[PDB]
Amino acid sequence: SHMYLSKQLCFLFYVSSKEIIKKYTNYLKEYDLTYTGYIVLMAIENDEKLNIKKLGERVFLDSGTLTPLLKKLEKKDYVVTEQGKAIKSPLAEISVKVFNEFNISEREASDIINNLRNFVS
Amino acid sequence: GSHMYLSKQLCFLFYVSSKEIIKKYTNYLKEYDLTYTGYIVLMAIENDENIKKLGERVFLDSGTLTPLLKKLKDYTEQGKAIKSPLAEISVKVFNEFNISEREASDIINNLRNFVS
């Protein structure tokens, strides 16, 4: 067990999320965004006006990688924005397309949300 | 609405969760001169034992994979002998999440829908 469980999880966590970012990455083209860039936005928009601290931590990024991405998202003029807040809807929508692409009912999603929420708890 | 809500949730949770995981392999991997990805590569190179078929099972641009395999260092005959301490790192890592062996398998039952 212990050997082959912790090994499955390893391959599974890698691959499953490896393919999740893949689908995200296609949709995010329409906006010239990196999946990581996307994540930052979704976070930014729920808090708004947060130090690179409450943010850099909430997105698990060292001040080193976050600064350049913040700058980038700024030239993009999504953060520096009113246009940014405009696409909150179509961006959010991307999370729905991505998981539908995996045939996930709201039943499967809930079950996963709970397993993952505990895992990370 | 709800479909939007749950996606949001799955998204954040998958992102946040794979961050906590990689972060932990990062520590433990220092023993070897390996990177997290360099580690999945090895774990994969070991499960299979073709380069373009590898970039695929491991999901990496051969523009990012080429450097990596070269390195992998004699990791071979001693890569086999080193295969269990390797394996144990996954145990060391997932054990830090203090989860039961059932929940452990649940996550596996769930994580499959993202492979099927």
Distance of CA B29 to the CA centre of its chain: 12
Cα(A46)–Cα(A58) distance, rounded to whole angstroms?
A: 11
Residue B39's closest CA among B15, B16, B60, B8?
Answer: B60
**Which of A40, A105, A28, A53 is CA-nearest to residue A79?**
A40
B66: number of Cβ within 10 Å: 12
Residue listed under structure tokens 């433990």: B28
* Structural tokens at position B63: 């523009």
Contact B16 A115 (CB under 8 A): no
The CATH number assigned to the domain holding B107 equals: 1.10.10.10
CA dist B20 and A70 (Å) reads 22
Q: Which sign, positive or negative, has the C-alpha torsion A22, A27, A32, A38? A: negative
Alpha-carbon separation of residue A48 from A10, A86, B113, B115 (angstroms): 34, 14, 34, 35
Q: Which two tokens stand for residue A40?
A: 């930052």
The Cα–Cα gap between A79 and A36 comes to 15
Q: Provide the shortest C-alpha distance from residue B74 to chain A (in Å).
A: 23
H-helix or E-strand containing A16? helix A2-27
Q: Are A16 and B110 in contact, with CB atoms under 8 Å apart?
A: no
Q: How far apart are CA A62 and CA A51, in angstroms?
A: 13
Residue pair A15/B59 in contact by the 8 Å Cβ criterion = yes
Residues in chain B: 116
What is d(CA B10, CA A110) in angstroms, rounded to the nearest whole number?
Answer: 8
Question: What kind of experiment solved this structure?
Answer: X-ray
d(CA A53, CA B48): 42
In 3D, which of B14, B46, B31 has the Cα closest to residue B92?
Answer: B31
B-chain CB neighbours of A102 within 8 Å are 113-114
Shortest Cα distance, chain B CAs vs residue A73, angstroms: 19
To the nearest 10°, report the CA torsion of A66, A71, A76, A81.
Answer: 90
CA–CA dist A13, B7 (Å, integer): 18
Note down the domain range covering B5.
1-116
Cα–Cα separations (whole angstroms), residue B37 to A14, B55, B59, B68, B75: 9, 11, 10, 9, 14
- HSE at residue A67, side-chain half, CA atoms within 13 A, is 3
Q: CA of B37, closest CA in chain A: separation in Å? A: 9
Of B44, B59, B111, Cβ closest to residue A13? B111
How far, rounded to the nearest angstrom, does the alpha carbon of residue B107 sit from its chain's CA centroid?
A: 15
**Concatenated DSSP letters for B43-108?**
HHHHH---HHHHHHHTT--HHHHHHHHHH------HHHHTHHHHHHHHHHHHGGG---HHHHHHHH
Q: Is A99 helix (H, G, I), strand (E, B) or coil?
A: helix
Distance CA A118, CA B6 (A): 16
The Cα–Cα gap between B26 and B19 comes to: 10
The answer for residues whose C-beta is within 8 angstroms of residue B31's C-beta and 6 or more apart is: B85, B89
Domain count, chain A: 1
Helix axis angle for A88-100 and A2-27, nearest 10°, is 130
Quote the tokens at residue A109: 């999603």
